[PDB]
Amino acid sequence: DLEDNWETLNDNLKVIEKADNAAQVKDALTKMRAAALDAQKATPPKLEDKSPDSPEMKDFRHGFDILVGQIDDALKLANEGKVKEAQAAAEQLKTTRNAYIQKYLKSLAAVSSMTMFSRVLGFARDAIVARIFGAGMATDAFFVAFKLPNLLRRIFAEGAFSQAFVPILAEYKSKQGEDATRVFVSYVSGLLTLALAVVTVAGMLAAPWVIMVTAPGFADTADKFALTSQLLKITFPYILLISLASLVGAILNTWNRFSIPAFAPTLLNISMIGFALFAAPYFNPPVLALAWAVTVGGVLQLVYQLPHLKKIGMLVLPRINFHDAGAMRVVKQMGPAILGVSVSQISLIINTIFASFLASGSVSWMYYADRLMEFPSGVLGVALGTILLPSLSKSFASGNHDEYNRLMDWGLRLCFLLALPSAVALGILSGPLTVSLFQYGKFTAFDALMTQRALIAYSVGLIGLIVVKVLAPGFYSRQDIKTPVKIAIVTLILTQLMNLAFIGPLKHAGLSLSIGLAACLNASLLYWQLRKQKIFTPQPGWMAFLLRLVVAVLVMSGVLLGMLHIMPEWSLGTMPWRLLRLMAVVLAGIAAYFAALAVLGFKVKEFA
């Protein structure tokens, strides 16, 4: 393992610095030479996608080549008896380790998205929007208006184009030479811009009909329709903006740094927060600012990535003139994908339909609770997507079931171990979180209470969602298995029946608990299809493990309730003090969970 070789070299380093004899020094330098050579063989986490001969791997190995050369100099020094000069070479090895190899140990999922800074900015945007005018009918209008184009970007930008554009661009980059890829991208971007322009123009023009079909209950309230349609007209261009930005993102991912495309969400965040502060007094009604803030943000996301595109010689001159020839090579991939992609959106439309006939603020409460949940979902998602998912990718590509099965069982253990706590911990600290983050002027306690009743309901979906993240790769890895679509269609029918049942008793929390239970049902159907297809057979010993995890989670839950009872009201004080009481309770509950685990026959060794 590369991590095994890495901790080996580190341990040997600290041994060299505290050494007394030339034998003790020559031995450690010798082992470090062997270990550096052997570490040259792993495909580092930042390059898991890359082939073992591409210049990225070449650069990785060259860093280690310099490492071994320095260790050879140090072995020569130690052979001449120069204990101090050998130690000097040892302490200067770290410079090479930091310069050439350290940029390759970052995770692909971590480099790809969600730096802590951008996360904090997104939370600041949600808190700022709530404080100036959140949880009203205005924010209901805006949130509906905002989600409506975010459904359409899934069919154009992220879903069908990841199905189609991402592999074909690599093919062109390798087999077809560099220059043809330019023209290829020219026509792809051209036809995309055209079809997106058709969509945005039609959507702006027919926006009232769109709101009818989406959220018809608003005509019960007075003026709700006019605001929602005006906001939708304002925010519809955003898809033509963000799909192009996504395309440029993927291209800049293929060639150069993955981080610049990841910054782009921060531009929407920044635009929204500044626009809300400095423009909301200017617009009447004021929610308009937000809507402009969206579109104003979108432009920036695009125009931020264009300059870097120039350097890699990929600045598109979007040519629309190949209606027949340029389209098909990518539109064939789109055709099979659009079924699974479109069905999924239909359900979320129907969920906003259900939410229209409720009380003013139901949509906004649901949205703020969704915004709270997004944080652990992303965190757990990326953590599991660097630890386990790449290893499963390898063990599917090469070896047969046995290894792949043992890996997948360890991963299914890990899913519960990391998600079940987080789920129930957010259940407990729902109240503290919503009040501390969102209680400010125009956000009453009632709004935080309803958002809390939705956060309880959304919590259940956390574990099911991450288990889906684990299990879906197994089917997508099989080249022609297209069942997930069937599982998704079943999930959406079940979701609509659950809402029917849950709306009466539970109001908007019913529609939220239905999504939470639906994620677990998606995971359960993928699992039952993973074990009835004979792809995987569960390892033995879960019953004891599950009971241990139950006890540890119950421990953490007990500590959280005890600390909460001590705590003062979560309204006392300003935002910093409320959030520093929350950090107290959070860190305490987390440390208590790990303490329980350690006492409950669990490991503590942590690496990377």
Swiss-Prot record:
GO terms for biological process: cell wall organization; glycolipid translocation; lipid translocation; lipid-linked peptidoglycan transport; peptidoglycan biosynthetic process; regulation of cell shape. Keywords: Cell inner membrane, Cell membrane, Cell shape, Cell wall biogenesis/degradation, Membrane, Peptidoglycan synthesis, Transmembrane, Transmembrane helix, Transport. Residues 171-183, 256-257, 309-324, 394-403, 476-480, 531-544, 601-608 are cytoplasmic. It is found in: Cell inner membrane. The keyword Membrane applies. One of its GO terms (molecular function) is cardiolipin binding. Pathway: Cell wall biogenesis; peptidoglycan biosynthesis. Changing residue 153 to C: Lack of activity. It holds the Pfam family MurJ. The keyword DNA repair does not apply. It is a multi-pass membrane protein. The chain crosses the membrane at residues 107-133, 142-170, 184-210, 225-255, 258-279, 287-308, 325-354, 365-393, 404-438, 448-475, 481-503, 511-530, 545-564, 579-600. One of its GO terms (cellular component) is division septum. Its main location: membrane. Residues 134-141, 211-224, 280-286, 355-364, 439-447, 504-510, 565-578 are periplasmic. Belongs to the MurJ/MviN family. Involved in peptidoglycan biosynthesis. Transports lipid-linked peptidoglycan precursors from the inner to the outer leaflet of the cytoplasmic membrane. FtsW (AC P0ABG4) is also proposed to act as a lipid II flippase. The identity of the lipid II flippase is controversial with conflicting in vivo and in vitro results. This is Lipid II flippase MurJ. It comes from Escherichia coli (strain K12). The lineage of its organism: Bacteria, Pseudomonadati, Pseudomonadota, Gammaproteobacteria, Enterobacterales.
